[PDB]
Amino acid sequence: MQLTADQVEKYKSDGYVLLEGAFSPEEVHVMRQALKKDQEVQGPHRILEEDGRTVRALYASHTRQSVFDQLSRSDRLLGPATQLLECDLYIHQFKINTKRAFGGDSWAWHQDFIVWRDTDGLPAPRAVNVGVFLSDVTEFNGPVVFLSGSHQRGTVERDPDDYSMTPAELSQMVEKHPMVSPKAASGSVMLFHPEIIHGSAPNISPFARDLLIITYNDVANAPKPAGEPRPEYVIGRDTTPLVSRSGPLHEAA
Amino acid sequence: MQLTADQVEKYKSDGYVLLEGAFSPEEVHVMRQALKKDQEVQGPHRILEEDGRTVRALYASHTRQSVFDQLSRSDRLLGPATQLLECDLYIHQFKINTKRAFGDSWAWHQDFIVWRDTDGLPAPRAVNVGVFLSDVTEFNGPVVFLSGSHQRGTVERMTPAELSQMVEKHPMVSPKAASGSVMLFHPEIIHGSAPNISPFARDLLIITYNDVANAPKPAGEPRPEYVIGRDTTPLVSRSGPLHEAA
């Protein structure tokens, strides 16, 4: 499973690329049932919404649900990831982000790499983020907004909650890096660069939007933290190369 | 300037219709210069943001800036409006709403019930005409309609649960188009405004045209004339481009 030449060049130039229809509706169903089951596990890997009534983020479902292990090693994701990075890979981070219905606007613009570098000791942006749409993503249910091409800016040379950017910063960025929101049916995949600027739009719809993000990292690019590292469910520690898996996802207890 | 057969049907079934490029870039420019001039006029018709820094809304700019008079009577707006209502028309309300950059809102509402029960508007024999003074994109806070929700009419004198039920039958749709575009929408349609997550303000002009025979009959103290029109004299339609005019 490979990106076309144009898809590679789109990833390189714009910082993201959308692969619609990567996983079938049957596969989406299997993953959604596994997500519902995993949301019942109580732990600090599960971030509840402010009102505590729903799950906002879930870390490391692939360690608890076999379907998500299957996904994480699927040819359809690791093929494109290996194509881009040309090395053995392991899972730096696995998370499922839920944007609740009627969720309101939050200032969430950020860049992944600078946090991983300065908080977690990630040396270099030799990684790729891979999103899997567990919901249809539309203009109304809180799509990810990229600043197109903004990964070309690199990252400044130089606790996690201290990082942020100002409206004035965002304004300057949009000048050369316009807002773009990939929209597609559940089962679609998008790959995006660790140094791209992104945020999610508010979900004004009555339905939650579930977005799975796997970050694959070069086994030679393992974090070298200076202090106590964050939990393994946030930042992977096992750099054993992933074994790729061929075939459909299937229900697995 | 007539709506096509499909555009009439669209308006009836879905409650809104978009006419892209109705006014040209040069006409948008003249309108935008008039907007900036009117935004400096102090008065109760000018609604500023809570920080007093910028203007959030302007009422009745057509009474102060000649190009907005020209706009308000353009045959490109009155042709469609007269075609839909088949009567003489006057201006019920003229408003410019500016959605500041980086500004949720939860603005789901229907105009007619407000005008009926606040102002004594008898019937929904009016049409709302939006004119895009800025581009309208998915990011700068477009109006979001619940398609077809005007078919519900209006109860005799909303919540998330109600909105969730509504969207099943009346899906969200947001007209998006370049500045100068026009959209007409039904007084009974449910609409809101998505948040503006962009760095630029979005300026949307709404003219409500009303049947001269449907003038408000308020039982209470009428709202001021710059909010709710009182002069029911039929509008004279104006042909031709907009032009700068002191």
Numbering used by the authors:
A (entry chain B): 1 to 158, 171 to 265
B (entry chain A): 1 to 103, 105 to 158, 177 to 265
What does the paper say about this structure?
Like LdoA and EcdK, GriE belongs to the 2OG-Fe(ii) oxygenase superfamily, whose members couple the decarboxylation of α-ketoglutarate to substrate oxygenation/hydroxylation via an oxo-ferryl intermediate. Recombinant GriH purified from S. lividans TK24 lacked the characteristic fluorescence of the expected F420 co-factor but nevertheless led to 4-MePro in a coupled assay with GriF, indicating that GriH can use NADH directly without requiring F420. Together, these experiments suggest that 4-MePro biosynthesis starts with the GriE-mediated hydroxylation of l-leucine, followed by oxidation with GriF. The crystal structures of the leucine hydroxylase GriE have been determined in complex with substrates and products, providing insight into the stereospecificity of the reaction.
